[PDB]
Amino acid sequence: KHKILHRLLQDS
Amino acid sequence: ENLYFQGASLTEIEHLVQSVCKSYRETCQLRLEDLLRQRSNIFSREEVTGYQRKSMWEMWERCAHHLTEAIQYVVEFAKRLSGFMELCQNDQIVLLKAGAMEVVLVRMCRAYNADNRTVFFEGKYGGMELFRALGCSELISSIFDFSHSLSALHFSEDEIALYTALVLINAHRPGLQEKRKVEQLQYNLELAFHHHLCKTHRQSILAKLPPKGKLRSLCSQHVERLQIFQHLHPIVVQAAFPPLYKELFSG
Ligand SMILES: COc1ccc([C@@H](NC(=O)C2=CCC(=O)N=C2)C(=O)Nc2ccc(C(C)C)cc2)cc1
Ligand code: NA
Structure with a gap:
């Protein structure tokens, strides 16, 4: 899933 | 895509040092x-006793939260x-899943x-006796021993910055x-880490650094x-453990 990690990485 | 994906000169290695140290400071x-x-x-002895009297699931949840907060700063x-x-x-994701912790x-x-x-x-500040309710004295004592051996190196903030960038950027993951x-x-x-150590006459720490298998263990x-812990309190993990923690350490 990696939902939170993807979000943290995308959130600029 | 990036200058550091190819061979870099001394001046670019010098800039990388300042860059890593800045990224860490922030x-x-x-x-x-x-x-x-x-x-x-x-x-106090009373405060330590209060932590020891806490349930295993409560201490695990408090520790999983604080660890999760620390990992968010590592992601940044x-x-x-x-x-x-x-x-x-x-x-x-591979680099952060294997290296954030x-x-x-x-x-x-x-x-x-x-x-x-x-x-x-x-x-x-508390001793390891503060975490006795966790029921993982081997892991806690091992973390304390590891922090004790790193403390003996008297790392500067710049050295921590550079070493920690290397812990994360590991091509063998x-x-x-x-x-x-x-x-x-x-x-x-x-090169940036070894350059800064050369410049500050701290190359002697290279032989004293922990083996890579110590962090993995x-x-x-x-x-x-x-x-x-999951076997004993599965609803505690599912309901109260941070989602980021479960993503990295459960699956
Ligand atoms: C960046 O380095 C650190 C980050 C956090 C801490 C400690 N922070 C807290 O206890 C904390 C309190 C309240 C809050 O909202 N967030 C965090 C920390 O997490 N300490 C710590 C020390 C040892 C362990 C293990 C040995 C169990 C776990 C946590 C220490 C160093
Ligand atoms: Na220390």
């Missing part, structure tokens, strides 16, 4: 000067790290006082799609102790 979570001043603020450190955002999304364990030595063997936890790109990034970061023990 993401270190806790100020070293605040940690050093708080060394006198130690938990990775994002500001020269070359990291130029890697693909799979590789960024290892970076937190290295960062931890700053919050650890070798003089009285205490760690900074929830506003004060299983699952890397752009292994050659990670390898070149690791090489330049190795601590992480493997963490995941193992999590599974034992």
Whole structure:
């Protein structure tokens, strides 16, 4: 899933 | 895609040093000067007893939260790290899943006082006896011993910055799609770290640094102790453990 990690990485 | 994905000159290695040190300064979570001043603020015998009297599930949840908060600052450190955002999304996740916890364990030595063997936890300094309710004395003692051995190196903030960037940018992590790109990034970061040590006459610490298997063993023990806790309190993990924690350490 990696939902939170993807979000943290995308959130600029 | 990035200068540090190819061979870099001395001047570019010098810039990389300043870049890593800056990225770390902006993401270190806790100020070293605040940690050093708080060394006198130690938990009372009554406070230690109160933590020992807490249920296993409550201590696990408090510890999983604080660890999760520390990992968020590591994610921000990775994002500001020269070359990291130029890697693909799979590789960024691979590097953070394998390395975030290892970076937190290295960062931890700053919050650890070798003089009285205490760690900074929830506003004060406490010994390992504070975590007795967790029921994983081997893992806790191993983390304390590791922080104790790192404390003996007397790392500066700049050295922590550079070493910690290397802990994260590890081209040998299983699952890397752009292994050659990670390898070149690791090489330049190795050069930046060794250059700063050369410049500050601190190359003597190279032989005294922990073996890479020591950080992996601590992480493997963490995941193992999590599974034992999960068996005993599965609804505690599912309902009360941070989603980021479960994503990295459960699956
Ligand atoms: C960046 O390095 C650190 C980050 C956090 C801490 C400690 N913070 C807290 O206890 C905390 C309190 C309240 C809050 O909202 N968030 C965090 C920390 O997490 N300490 C710590 C020390 C040892 C362990 C293990 C040995 C169990 C776990 C946590 C220490 C060093
Ligand atoms: Na220390």
